[PDB]
Amino acid sequence: MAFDLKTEDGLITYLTKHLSLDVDTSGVKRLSGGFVNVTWRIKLNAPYQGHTSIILKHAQPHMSTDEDFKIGVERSVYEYQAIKLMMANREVLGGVDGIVSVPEGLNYDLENNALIMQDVGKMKTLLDYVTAKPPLATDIARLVGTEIGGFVARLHNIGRERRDDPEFKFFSGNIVGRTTSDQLYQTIIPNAAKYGVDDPLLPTVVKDLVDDVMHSEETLVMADLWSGNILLQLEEGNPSKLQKIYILDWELCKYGPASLDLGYFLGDCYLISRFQDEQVGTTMRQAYLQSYARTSKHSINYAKVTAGIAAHIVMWTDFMQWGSEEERINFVKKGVAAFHDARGNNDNGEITSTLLKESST
């Protein structure tokens, strides 16, 4: 039987009894966030594979607040294998300056649904920086967009090149990653409805998004690329130099359309720009498209990226609770209109023309 990784005592018993770790019980902290995972920071008296501080993520089989939303615990072995694969390809993915990194994966335990990784440090997320007042310095925002765009383009390039390598093909079988995207797309119609939008085109839009995520083998996608999954390490003493970017939360990593990653991050940039700081969100979006387009060996499908941004806006706007109710309803309608532009006869849609302008050489 399993240990109880949802409680501090069960976590300490698991670490000491099942893994023989030497735990500093005063340094065990429950980390906030997550409705489907319980995350702990653990200080150790003795190093575990060279680390004296670790993070443990425990995957639950459902949302804590809604046990009818099912999500398979096997996603956790894909997160472990994904950060192993990124570390095995870090020199090329991290580029000529090595700013973008991922945490090192130390252990995955099947029967306890427990993933242990390196604690890359107590850090604020990009989401914290862009919602802080005053916001993230525009110079850092540009660098962040540039470095993330380059990392993602290099991830998509190598995913295409090594598609049939076994260690890559593994992620085509992250059925929880694919299914979870399916389930998230299914919230598009209810979220629009909530804001008084009954668009009978939306069932057709959703079916296309779902068929693509369930079946696409295009490339390796990080699959949860928004500001809440990105850590910024700023210089200690100098809060104006970016030293590292850490990309976390790879449990949905799968093969899928390249436009899925672009839709996540660019969609988040649209929410940021709309509701937090226009220059921050816009600088980040433009630098991301510039860097991604230049590094990617494959054409951006601007219609599918438009639909991805649209899906992100509908799926996430109410969740974020930014701005007023009226502004959110207008923003969601703009997302719904973008869906119609993506199925249009032309690239003249508002969002599509912005993507083209900002990605241009």
Ligand X SMILES: NCCc1c[nH]c2ccccc12
Catalytic site positions:
224
Interaction pattern, residues 165-204, with ligand X; x per rule: CB under 6 A = ---------------x------------------------
Q: Known binder of ligand: residue 119? A: yes
Site string for ligand X, 266-285 (x = CB under 6 A): --------------------
Residue placing its CB nearer to ligand X in the complex, 35 or 243: 35
Q: What are the angstrom distances between the C-alpha of 10 and each of 7, 14, 106, 155?
A: 5, 6, 20, 37
Q: Whose Cβ is closer to ligand ADP: residue 120's or residue 148's? A: 120
* Distance, CA of 78 to CA of 269 (rounded, Å): 27
Q: How many Cα neighbours within 13 Å face the side chain of 179?
A: 11
Residue 35 found at the interface with ligand X (CB under 6 A): yes
Q: How far is the CB of 1 from ligand X (least distance, A)?
A: 26
Q: Say if residue 251 carries a ligand binding annotation.
A: yes
Selection from ligand ADP, Ca ion, ligand X, none that 340 binds (CB < 5 to 8 A by kind) is: Ca ion
Least distance in angstroms from the C-beta of 60 to ligand X: 10
Site for ligand X in 45-74 (CB under 6 A): 63, 71
Residue 119 to residue 320: CA distance in whole angstroms? 27
249 carries a ligand binding annotation:
yes
| CA 242 to chain CA mean position, Å | 20
CB-based burial label for 117 (10 Å; 0-12, 13-18, 19+): buried
In angstroms, the CA 34 to CA 5 distance is 14
Q: Which is nearer to ligand ADP, 80 or 339 (CB)?
A: 80
Contact predicate 150/289, CB 8 Å:
no
Q: Count Cβ atoms below 10 Å from residue 29 Cβ, excluding itself.
A: 13
- Give the binding site for ligand X (CB under 6 A): 35-36, 63, 71, 180
- Give the binding site for Ca ion (CB under 5 A): 340
Binding residues for ATP, by number, are 37, 57, 118-120, 249-251
